[PDB]
Amino acid sequence: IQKTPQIQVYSRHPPENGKPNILNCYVTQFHPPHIEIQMLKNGKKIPKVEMSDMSFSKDWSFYILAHTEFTPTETDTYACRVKHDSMAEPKTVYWDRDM
């Protein structure tokens, strides 16, 4: 009865090193609605992570948008880690500036 979350990690605007932006972690296709979303900077937890109110689709699966303020650099690594009961372990998805 459980649905595995699909994850997308990407910036609000095309990324430019040294220019403020927003990093998004869009999580969809999950059930039950209980989910734990963490955004990571160089493997460490980002404190100020804003969450959208949770909504669901016609197919009954839930979706939520998590975001954070960030200034990209050439070497900083960003990721979104998701913990949901449909998975045996947390799922990590790295930000790829080209995607």
Partner: protein, 278 residues
């Protein structure tokens, strides 16, 4: 054009962690305009679009009292379902509902919706005739029988043809100017190295609204299907959407490929190629 008023409702039990969490979300033509969230001391129906702010205190009061009533009905429904399925008391369960109307340009009802799900699976739904119910399993047949006797379909039909249609008209008089918002996509092509003599061309569509869009890649007047990568349309978080489509192409052959962007805000679809910077 056609218009819709739909309420997406969720009740989630959390044994020991408190009372079930209850949500009522209203959408006018796919846009969220009102929200009730039980997870508060004095919870209230809230506007989610600025054009709803004009509704007076009697409106907010009636909707709040009604949502708290529905919340209590779903709290009972959660206990009733545990019995129907023979489930233990300590597990978290979900009830979801989609309720509302779709009306045509002529003001006539096109579709009425009253669909229930239990633990993310169809439970019971009002059929298109607005007279009969489709029960997904054994437990839903108990609900079907109860609702057939009580004349539930007829009560719902009165709501869908009356209140729902009438209230959608009211909301559309308020939100129509904002609701008809169309932001055309702004498109660009990016170039990325691949191993050997290959490159990736990624066609981007940004800042568009509504979310419905189509991106294609063409080579020699034919659309590329196999070997074309895409991402699901996604929110930028500022009210606009993003999408990309990419293809792996031979190095030196970038100008043989064209990206096409199709959107309602595009009288003419966008046609673009990789433009190597100056």
């Amino acid at each position: 054009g056609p218009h819709s008023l739909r309420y997406f409702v969720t009740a989630v039990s959390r044994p020991g962690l408190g009372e079930p969490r209850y949500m009522e979300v209203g959408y006018v033509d796919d846009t969220e305009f009102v929200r009730f969230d039980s997870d508060a001391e004095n919870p209230r129906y809230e506007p989610r679009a600025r054009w709803m702010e004009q509704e007076g205190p009697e409106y907010w009061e009636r909707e709040t009292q009604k949502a708290k009533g529905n919340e209590q009905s779903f709290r009972v429904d959660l206990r009733t379902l545990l019995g129907y399925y023979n489930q233990s008391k300590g597990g978290s369960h979900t009830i979801q509902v989609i309720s509302g109307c779709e009306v045509g340009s002529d003001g006539r009802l096109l579709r009425g919706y009253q669909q229930y799900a239990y633990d993310g699976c169809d439970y019971i739904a009002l059929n298109e005739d607005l007279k009969t119910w489709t029960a997904a399993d054994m437990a839903a047949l108990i609900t079907k029988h109860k609702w057939e006797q009580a004349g539930e379909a007829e009560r719902l039909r009165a709501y869908l043809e009356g209140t729902c249609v009438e209230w959608l008209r009211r909301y559309l008089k308020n939100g129509n100017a904002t609701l008809l918002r169309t932001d055309s996509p702004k498109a660009h092509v990016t170039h990325h190295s691949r191993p050997e003599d290959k490159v990736t061309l990624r066609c981007w569509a940004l800042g568009f609204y509504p979310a419905d869009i189509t991106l294609t890649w063409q080579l020699n007047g034919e659309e590329l299907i196999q070997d074309m990568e895409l991402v699901e349309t996604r929110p930028a978080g500022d009210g606009t959407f993003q999408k990309w489509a990419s293809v792996v192409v031979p190095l030196g052959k970038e100008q043989y490929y064209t990206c096409h962007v199709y959107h309602q805000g595009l009288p003419e679809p966008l046609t673009l190629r990789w433009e190597p910077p100056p």
